[PDB]
């Protein structure tokens, strides 16, 4: 890689242009944030976290003894938006499937009051979870910079939760293994006032133990497959030589 920064920026901008979306992908190396993509001003704008919030819901539920990691959440038998959710599952399984009913149940066990306190204590986003404990991941919003930093915190065990709570949640987030590098992350897709947001927020753990946090953020459009979030992310990390 004698590749110019101009060429990196152009290549990653083109992965967003080809998907016909507007988005950004923030990469963090040590303390330095780099911003890539075809809509850089997204970096400090606020969007609903949607399902990226499952990472924090899990940390809170575990820290506070609302569940354990091997506990099986039974499917209640009612029809689900997706068949894959019609099954009994652990928090970790529900993370990978982004299964809402499980994370909703966990949120209800935690309850609105404790969820409020705990979201303030962690200072996640704008920190407002409103009056509904299972529908809030509006008015809670967060920026892509704030997401990559949250990812940075979790990857290095700096959030204010016990170490073992943080390691337990990190084990849930492994979504890919590419050439001795592991990718931990959580996806999101939220409907906002007039637009949809897509997220993929996590970190690359390299063979040598180095951790590189990232947050992809983009506009989802009718018709898009969700796996475009992953594909843009993996191409970008690869172009940068990070995986």
Ligand X SMILES: *C(=O)[C@@H](NC(=O)/C(=N/OC(C)(C)C(=O)O)c1csc(N)n1)[C@H](C)NS(=O)(=O)O
Task: Among 21, 38, 57, 98, indicate the residue that binds ligand X (CB under 6 A).
Answer: 98
Establish if 196 lies at the interface with ligand X (CB under 6 A): yes
Task: Among 111, 139, 180, 226, indicate the residue that binds ligand X (CB under 6 A).
Answer: 226
CA angle 73, 74, 78 (to 5 degrees): 125
CA distance linking residue 35 with residue 9, whole number of Å? 9
Encoded tokens for 44: 């400090």
- CB nearer to ligand X: pick between 24 and 185: 185
- CB nearer to ligand X: pick between 192 and 235: 192
Establish if 161 lies at the interface with ligand X (CB under 6 A): no
Establish if 103 lies at the interface with ligand X (CB under 6 A): no
Establish if 144 lies at the interface with ligand X (CB under 6 A): no
- The residue range among 12-20, 22-30, 187-195, 211-219 that interacts with ligand X, by the rule CB under 6 A, is 187-195
- CB nearer to ligand X: pick between 146 and 196: 196
Distance of CA 128 to the CA centre of its chain: 18
CA distance linking residue 198 with residue 222, whole number of Å? 12
Could you report how far apart the first and last alpha carbons of the chain are, in Å?
Answer: 13
Establish if 48 lies at the interface with ligand X (CB under 6 A): yes
- CB nearer to ligand X: pick between 51 and 165: 51
DSSP string, 64-101: TTS--SS--B---S---SSGGGSS-B-HHHHHHTT-HH
Task: Among 36, 137, 203, 214, indicate the residue that binds ligand X (CB under 6 A).
Answer: 137
**Which residues belong to the active site?**
51
CA distance linking residue 85 with residue 91, whole number of Å? 12
Residues within the interface to ligand X (CB under 6 A): 48, 50-51, 98, 100, 137-138, 187-191, 196, 226
């Amino acid at each position: 890689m004698h590749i110019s920064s101009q060429q990196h920026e152009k290549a990653i901008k083109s992965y967003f242009d080809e998907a016909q979306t507007q988005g950004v992908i923030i990469i963090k190396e040590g303390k330095n944030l780099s911003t890539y993509g075809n809509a850089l001003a997204r970096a400090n704008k606020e969007y609903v976290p949607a399902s990226t919030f499952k990472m924090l819901n899990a940390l809170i539920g575990l820290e506070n003894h609302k569940a354990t990691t091997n506990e099986i959440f039974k499917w209640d038998g009612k029809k689900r938006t997706y068949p894959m959710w019609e099954k009994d599952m652990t928090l970790g399984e529900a993370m990978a499937l982004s299964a809402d009913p499980v994370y909703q149940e966990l949120a209800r066990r935690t309850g609105l009051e404790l969820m409020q306190k705990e979201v303030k204590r962690v200072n996640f986003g704008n920190t407002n979870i409103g009056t509904q404990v299972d529908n809030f991941w509006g008015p809670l919003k967060i920026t892509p910079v704030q997401e990559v930093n949250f990812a940075d915190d979790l990857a290095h065990n700096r959030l204010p939760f016990k170490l073992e709570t943080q390691e337990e949640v990190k084990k849930m987030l492994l979504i890919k293994e590419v050439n001795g590098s592991k990718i931990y992350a959580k996806s999101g897709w939220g409907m906002g006032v007039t637009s949809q947001v897509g997220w993929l927020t996590g970190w690359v753990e390299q063979a040598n133990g180095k951790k590189i946090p990232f947050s992809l953020n983009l506009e989802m459009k009718e018709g898009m497959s969700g796996s475009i979030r992953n594909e843009i992310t993996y191409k970008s990390l690869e172009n940068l030589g990070i995986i």
